[PDB]
């Protein structure tokens, strides 16, 4: 299929960028598209053969080059806040023989005005309520990642070291904290629902993980707070029961009984040595 | 192509149609795009008629100048965006903008309620949760600017073969409680607002009791110590009588 | 990365503790406090340490075809033989102590005279 790199990229006004597209099913000719809300897909450039490039519909600000028969990169000369979009790459065999394009996975760009606007998320985890557990006998967990910029997160759930895919619903679009301003931050939520007897075990381990995509080590940071880079942020919980008898307290009972019986056995061996010595002393003094 | 999200009850027949008036095209296709992914080809036809590939079915009308697509046995896993495209014998396929589609499920036994989830001890928020609805209920946005409401989503749990609706509210300020949270929305009568008095079934907690190998070994050691006390105490009581009977 | 390539893989269902060496080779060699302890071919990639309730410690290394890696010190303390001390525990221990010394003292009383 068609592969392209990177997935996510943030850059300031006045910075070049090169993003790659690759292909190996021996097709020959390639295109570039962009996509906006309420505009559809629009063509940028295309290259009908190895060495020949034409123009499309919105080409201002872009540059292409077709050297080999597997690669066709794209360059942004100097980026502006109208370049914020999602960019796709398509491929076909030969010129109307079978009109089946093959699109790649995508690449998201945002163009800010200054690097002081970038922030990582903050994650918290909220444990289910007792009224749901007694009314319906199921439990729901909630994860909130709030307050990040830009919009390049990925969320997951991990139970006992393994990912889960059943019982999860994430919001499709991140929301804005004040939807009237321009450089505003974001927020996003998710759910996990699970049977009641699986939450009542104190041996199970739950966590919500968020992958962020920010700056790198070629950037200038002259600010007091830490440099927002690419990281993973998360939050965790053990299962727990409110009332009754778990396997956490059975251990306490067994330990206390062990120490009590060891002490009593020690006293009984002392008394055995006493009365044995008295009987032996008596039997010696009988002679 | 006409935009606008259209809601379909689950298990129906869906009808989408484009109009290409006017030119003379020859090669037709349809694409599907999920959220935050790329497009993907579904059906490829270039004759007038039908070419079925399962439960998908397309029609072409040359003289009437409209095409169509039909989906039967519509699942909730078809909520996506569908894009019609056409071309000449040459290059430069021409696209339409697309149409969002929504299929909402059957919800056979509703039981609506509003629950107050426990805190976090790491943040200063507190969330409410309004769960399974009957799928006709509309959830409105908030009025204050310190309260956040989300839209309604569907989750599918397959360890019990069950599906549900949900919506989440959260806020920072005081005088926020779950009895006044979804006030701006129209709400069904007799939803279940619970009371703060506790209710903890004790017979349900015994349904998840586990055992390790360490607990087995420690219980058996206690069993051994009880026997040793019986034997040594038998010895002491036998010897304490001989010394005084003499 | 700076020659740090031994990581820990935790929170499994059984209480096992595993270690993954990060190098592209086959026939990975493991060391512990300098001396060799193991031999791991392909189709297994993770060294087993045992359960965490026996709380392992030590300093571990791996090598491939290049030089050795830097150590990693592991330290567990999951206490698992602990007793919380309350009013009830101390009351039971004191009461059992008093009644046992009373029975033994009556026995010595009839022994002596």
């Amino acid at each position: 299929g068609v592969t392209q790199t990177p997935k996510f990229q943030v850059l300031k006004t006045g910075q070049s960028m090169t993003l790659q597209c690759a292909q190996d099913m021996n097709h020959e000719y390639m295109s570039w598209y962009r996509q906006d809300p309420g505009m559809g897909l629009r063509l940028i450039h295309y290259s009908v053969g190895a060495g020949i490039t034409d123009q499309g519909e919105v080409p201002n600000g872009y540059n292409v080059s077709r050297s080999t028969t597997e690669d066709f990169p794209l360059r942004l000369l100097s980026a502006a806040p109208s370049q914020t979009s999602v960019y796709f790459c398509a491929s076909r065999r030969r010129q109307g023989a079978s009109g089946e394009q093959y699109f790649g996975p995508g690449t998201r760009l945002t163009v800010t005005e200054d690097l002081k606007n970038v922030f990582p998320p903050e994650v918290a985890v909220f444990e289910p309520s007792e009224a749901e557990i007694s009314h319906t006998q199921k439990a729901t967990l909630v994860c909130l990642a709030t307050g990040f910029y830009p919009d390049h997160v990925e969320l997951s759930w991990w139970v006992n070291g393994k990912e889960v895919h059943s019982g999860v619903s994430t919001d499709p679009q991140p929301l804005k904290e004040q939807p009237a301003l321009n450089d505003s931050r974001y927020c996003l939520s998710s759910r996990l629902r699970v049977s009641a007897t699986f939450w009542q075990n104190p041996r199970n381990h739950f966590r919500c993980q968020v992958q962020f995509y920010g700056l790198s080590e070629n950037d200038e940071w002259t600010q007091d707070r830490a440099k927002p880079v690419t990281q993973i942020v998360s939050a965790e919980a053990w299962g727990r029961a409110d009332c009754g008898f778990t396997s956490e307290s059975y251990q306490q009972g067994v330990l206390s009984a062990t120490i009590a019986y060891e002490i009593a056995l020690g006293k009984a061996t002392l008394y055995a040595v006493l009365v044995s010595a008295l009987v032996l002393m008596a039997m010696v003094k009988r002679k | 192509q006409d935009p606008g999200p259209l809601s379909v009850p689950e298990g129906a027949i869906v009808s989408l149609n484009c109009t290409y008036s006017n030119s003379a095209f020859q090669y037709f296709m349809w694409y599907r795009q999920y959220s935050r992914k790329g497009p993907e080809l579904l059906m490829y036809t270039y004759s007038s008629g039908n070419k079925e590939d399962g439960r998908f079915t397309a029609q072409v009308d040359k003289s009437s100048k409209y095409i169509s697509l039909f989906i039967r046995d519509s699942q909730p896993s078809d909520s996506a965006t569908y894009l019609c495209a056409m071309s000449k014998g040459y290059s430069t396929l021409t696209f339409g903008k697309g149409t969002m589609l929504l299929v909402s499920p059957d919800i056979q036994n509703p039981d609506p309620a509003v629950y107050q989830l426990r805190d976090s001890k790491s943040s200063d928020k507190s969330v409410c949760l309004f769960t399974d609805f009957d799928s006709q209920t509309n959830v409105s946005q908030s009025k204050d600017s310190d309260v956040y409401i989300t839209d309604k989503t569907v989750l599918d749990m397959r360890s019990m073969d069950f599906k549900s609706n949900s919506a989440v509210a959260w806020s920072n300020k005081s005088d926020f409680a779950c009895a006044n949270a979804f006030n701006n929305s129209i709400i069904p009568e007799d939803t279940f607002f619970p009371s703060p008095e506790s209710s903890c079934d004790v017979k349900l907690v015994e349904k998840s009791f586990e055992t390790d190998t360490n607990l087995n070994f420690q219980n058996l050691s206690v069993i051994g110590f009880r026997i040793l006390l019986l034997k040594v105490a038998g010895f002491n009581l036998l010897m304490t009588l001989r010394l005084w009977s003499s | 990365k700076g020659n740090h390539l031994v990581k820990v893989y935790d929170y499994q269902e059984d209480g096992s503790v595993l270690l993954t060496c990060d190098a592209e080779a086959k026939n990975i060699t493991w060391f512990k406090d300098g001396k060799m302890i193991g031999f791991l071919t392909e189709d297994k990639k993770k060294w087993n340490l045992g359960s965490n309730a026996k709380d392992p410690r030590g300093m571990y290394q791996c090598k491939g075809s290049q030089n050795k890696s830097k150590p990693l010190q592991v330290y567990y303390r999951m206490c698992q033989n602990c007793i919380e001390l309350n009013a009830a525990t101390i009351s039971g221990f004191l009461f059992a102590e008093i009644v046992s010394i009373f029975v033994l003292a009556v026995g010595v009383y009839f022994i002596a005279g």
């Binding site: 008898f245 059975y250 009972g253 067994v254 009984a257 | 015994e206 009880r226 006390l229 105490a233 009581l237 304490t240 009588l241 | 059992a96 009644v99 029975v103």
Partner: peptide, 29 residues
């Protein structure tokens, strides 16, 4: 049933009773 504390407390009653009652029987013989 579940809580084993009742079994230990019940074990600490019958043991002393069974010692004292045994040593009181062999003496009357």
């Amino acid at each position: 049933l579940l809580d084993p504390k009742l079994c230990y407390l019940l074990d600490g009653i019958l043991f002393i009773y069974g010692v004292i009652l045994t040593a009181l029987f062999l003496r009357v013989k």
